[PDB]
A and B are shown apart, each in its own frame.
Chain A
Amino acid sequence: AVQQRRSSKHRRDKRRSHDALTAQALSVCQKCGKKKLFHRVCSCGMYGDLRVKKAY
């Protein structure tokens, strides 16, 4: 099955109206200050007060 009529440039944007992106929640590390996405280990391997991995 294929479109018997061409879809205009307006129906295309109406369908894409729901294709927008969402900003992931971010927080501040408590030992170095750089922003990291929430509930994940920072770049220093320091999650909370626990040294997870060696520094980058």
Chain B
Amino acid sequence: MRIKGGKQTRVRRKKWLKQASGSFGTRHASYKVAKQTVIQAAKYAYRDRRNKKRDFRSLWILRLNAALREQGMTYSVFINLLKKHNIEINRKVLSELAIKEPSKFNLIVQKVKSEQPK
């Protein structure tokens, strides 16, 4: 019983080739280089999901910090005032407010500024 390989190697090879579509030259043509690039690309994608979670936080912090310095308050004290006033809002939504709703963002800063903590 001589089992002969055909359509088994080609199908699993073409899957890797399909994944590595849009690469530079031989990186999409040859199966070997395509397989290496897909594995490396998967590693990159894994690492950059974690790094995206951190980098977008940093960007929101930067935007919020800037929005506060125009009014004379700093980020380091704004978050402290937020905690003492029990207000719980993401820096993402706060930055979205300062870019989309200047009046309501200014309302939040006014309350945290001076109103009695709790």
Determine direct contact between A and B, CB below 8 Å: yes
| A residues at B contact (CB < 8 Å) | 8-10
Specify which chain A residues have a CB less than 8 angstroms from the CB of B103 in the assembled complex: none
A8 to chain B, nearest CB (A): 6
B37 to chain A, nearest CB (A): 15
A6 to chain B, nearest CB (A): 10
Chain A interface, DSSP helix/strand/loop, else mixed:
helix
Determine whether B110 belongs to the interface, using a CB cutoff of 8 Å to chain A.
no
Q: Please, how many residues of chain B have a CB less than 8 angstroms from a CB on the other chain?
A: 2
CA distance A9 to B26 in the complex (A): 9
Q: Among residues 8 to 55 in chain B, which have CB atoms less than 8 Å away from a CB atom of chain A?
A: 25-26
A11 to chain B, nearest CB (A): 11
Specify which chain A residues have a CB less than 8 angstroms from the CB of B26 in the assembled complex: 8
Specify which chain B residues have a CB less than 8 angstroms from the CB of A10 in the assembled complex: 25
CA distance A9 to B30 in the complex (A): 14
B83-100 near A? 1/0 per residue, CB < 8 Å: 000000000000000000
CA distance A8 to B25 in the complex (A): 8
A7 to chain B, nearest CB (A): 12
User: Looking across the interface, which residue of chain B has its beta carbon closest to that of A8?
Assistant: B25
CA distance A39 to B26 in the complex (A): 50
B28 to chain A, nearest CB (A): 13
CA distance A56 to B26 in the complex (A): 56
A-B contact pairs, 4 of them (CB 8 A): A8-B25, A8-B26, A9-B25, A10-B25
